[PDB]
Design a protein around this ligand. Sequence first.
Ligand SMILES: *P(=O)(O)[C@H](Cc1ccccc1)NC(=O)[C@@H]1CCCN1C(=O)[C@@H](NC(=O)CCC(=O)O)C(C)C
Length: 224
Amino acid sequence: IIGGRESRPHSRPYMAYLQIQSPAGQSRCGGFLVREDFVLTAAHCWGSNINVTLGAHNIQRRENTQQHITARRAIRHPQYNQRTIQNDIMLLQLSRRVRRNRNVNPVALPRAQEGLRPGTLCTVAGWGRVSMRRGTDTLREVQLRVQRDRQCLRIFGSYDPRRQICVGDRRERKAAFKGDSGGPLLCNNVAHGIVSYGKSSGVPPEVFTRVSSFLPWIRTTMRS
Ligand SMILES: *P(=O)(O)[C@H](Cc1ccccc1)NC(=O)[C@@H]1CCCN1C(=O)[C@@H](NC(=O)CCC(=O)O)C(C)C
C-alpha cells in the first residue's frame, strides 16, 4: 500500500495473508475471508501450495490471534487469462474452517450485478510494499477514489468495464501496489473489488477485479 497508514490492529478481521509455495517467501499476496472455509483472492496468486494466515496484524510475529490454515483447493476462474490478466479471481477452499471470532470473520459481498459510481471513496488494505524501496510488517490501508471506466479504457489495453473496476485518482499518490494483489476494495463496507494490476510505477489508476460480476460463479463454487 502506497500513501496509506497502518490499520488499527485487528480492525479488518477478514484480511488474509497468503504465503505461496516454498521456500517461505517464494511469493506473497493478500486475500479476504468470504466464508469460514473460503478465501477470495486473485487467480494470478495461484501456487501449488498456499498457506493462509488469518487474524494477523504483524505478519512477522507469532501473534496469538493468528490462525494458519493450508488451502485444500485453489480454484482459479475457468477463463482466467494470464496474458491479459482478465478474470483475475480465485477461491481458496480451506482445509479446515476458521474458528470464528472478533479477530477472524468474513466480509460481506455485494449483490449480483451491483455497480459502483465513479467518485465513490473505497478502502483497500494489505501487507504490500509502500514504495519501491520498502515494504511493511504490519497491515496498512488507504482510501482510493473510483474512476470512470473510460479512463482505464484508454490506459490499459485489455480493460473490460463489465468485469473490472478502474481505481485511483492519478492526482493522489495513493494506490494498492506489489504484494497487495488479492486484497479487497471495500466500498461502503462491502467487498466490491480485488487488487489485480497496474503500472510498474504504482501510479494510478489501477485495475481491480469487479466481484459483483462473478457472484454466480462464486456461489456455485462454494455450494458445490
Ligand atoms: P500483485 O501481485 O501484488 C500486483 C499488484 C500491483 C498493483 C499495481 C501496480 C503494480 C502491482 N499485481 C501484479 O504484479 C500483476 C500480476 C502480474 C502482472 N501484474 C502487474 O500488474 C504488471 N503490470 C502490468 O502488466 C501493466 C503494465 C503497464 O500497462 O504499465 C507489472 C508486473 C507491475
